[PDB]
Design an enzyme around this catalytic site. Sequence first.
Site, PDB file in Angstrom:
ATOM      1  N   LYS A  61       0.818  -1.255   0.031  1.00  0.00           N
ATOM      2  CA  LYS A  61      -0.142  -0.163   0.005  1.00  0.00           C
ATOM      3  C   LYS A  61       1.002   1.311   0.128  1.00  0.00           C
ATOM      4  CE  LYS A  61      -3.994  -1.731   2.197  1.00  0.00           C
ATOM      5  NZ  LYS A  61      -3.953  -3.277   1.794  1.00  0.00           N
ATOM      6  N   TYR A 167       1.525  16.936  29.953  1.00  0.00           N
ATOM      7  CA  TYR A 167       2.047  17.926  30.559  1.00  0.00           C
ATOM      8  C   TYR A 167       3.415  17.823  31.196  1.00  0.00           C
ATOM      9  CZ  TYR A 167       2.505  21.663  34.137  1.00  0.00           C
ATOM     10  OH  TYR A 167       3.040  22.634  34.988  1.00  0.00           O
ATOM     11  N   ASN A 262       3.532   3.036  27.568  1.00  0.00           N
ATOM     12  CA  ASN A 262       3.209   2.040  28.511  1.00  0.00           C
ATOM     13  C   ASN A 262       2.737   0.738  28.083  1.00  0.00           C
ATOM     14  OD1 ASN A 262       3.224   3.944  30.694  1.00  0.00           O
ATOM     15  ND2 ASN A 262       0.912   4.270  30.692  1.00  0.00           N
TER      16      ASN A 262
END
Length: 324
Positions: A61, A167, A262
């Site tokens: 693709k 943050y 994570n």
Amino acid sequence: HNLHITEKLEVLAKAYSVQGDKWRALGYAKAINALKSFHKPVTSYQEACSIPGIGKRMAEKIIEILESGHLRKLDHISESVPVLELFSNIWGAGTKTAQMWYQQGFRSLEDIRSQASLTTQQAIGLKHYSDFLERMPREEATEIEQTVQKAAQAFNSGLLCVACGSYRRGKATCGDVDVLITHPDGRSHRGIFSRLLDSLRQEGFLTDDLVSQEENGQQQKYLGVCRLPGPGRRHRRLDIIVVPYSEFACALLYFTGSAHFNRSMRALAKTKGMSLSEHALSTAVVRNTHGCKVGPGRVLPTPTEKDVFRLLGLPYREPAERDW
DNA sequence: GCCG
DNA sequence: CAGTACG
DNA sequence: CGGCCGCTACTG
Ligand SMILES: [Mg+2]
Ligand code: NA
Ligand code: NA
């Protein structure tokens, strides 16, 4: 970098996601991620495959977008996708609710607003639809953390409050504000949500609650909506977690993310017979043939984020370095 | 979708 | 429980 | 063949 190709893929990845094709979407999510981080642009088929996260199917693709200039797979995407995306962007509604609403003939928020049965959460999500799609300058995120911290330290100056997520990773803008609250002694954090939330409600800082099991003294999180005082203020998403000090590092690591960071870190821990979660890092875990944690292993002492990386045989990374 |  | 959500 | 993060945390 490869925007000419990734921008086309992201459209495709989003289509599969809203349709509930979770794994395929994850596939594209990883290929799109690899490209965006590849120094030079792609030019050859082999050049693709060679890259981690990209295989034959995908490489093929990626060829089109270059030679073909455009991917023909994007021309047969169900007309339902834009509406599904519109629907799933309502907080509290996922792929299942979106497809149900669509099957029922709904096509716009106007239809949802006047004819759809909404859960308490979705009603709140809809009333703040545009706000929940915007990001805030990090400075505002600071004002919010400060507001929460002040109210918390008001009844216990010992309380430790820290803004996490994007943050802490140092991004210029934040989707919401993640505040981790814990206490150095290791016990003075129990059953405080009641006091904290009520305090914040007093001054009218909190506007709506999405997730808050307050009848339970074991509440771990609060997901809600708040708005700073003054003109020109928008409603912002606020997520607060209170954790026992012994789990501080794992909690901080989790809440700082990124999410994909994570997941990658947890995947690695599993390959080493360990297990990582926001509560702890364990070793010698017992898993079935499907890799599910059946038997508990041993919780390892993890006083700091440094320790978690170390125990996993990994070089430490500053928050800004976990922005995956 | 990719990977082992 | 299925759904949705958090990083 | 089958996992792809968490024996993650609420909601109803
Ligand atoms: Mg965040
Ligand atoms: Na949603
Ligand atoms: Na509640």
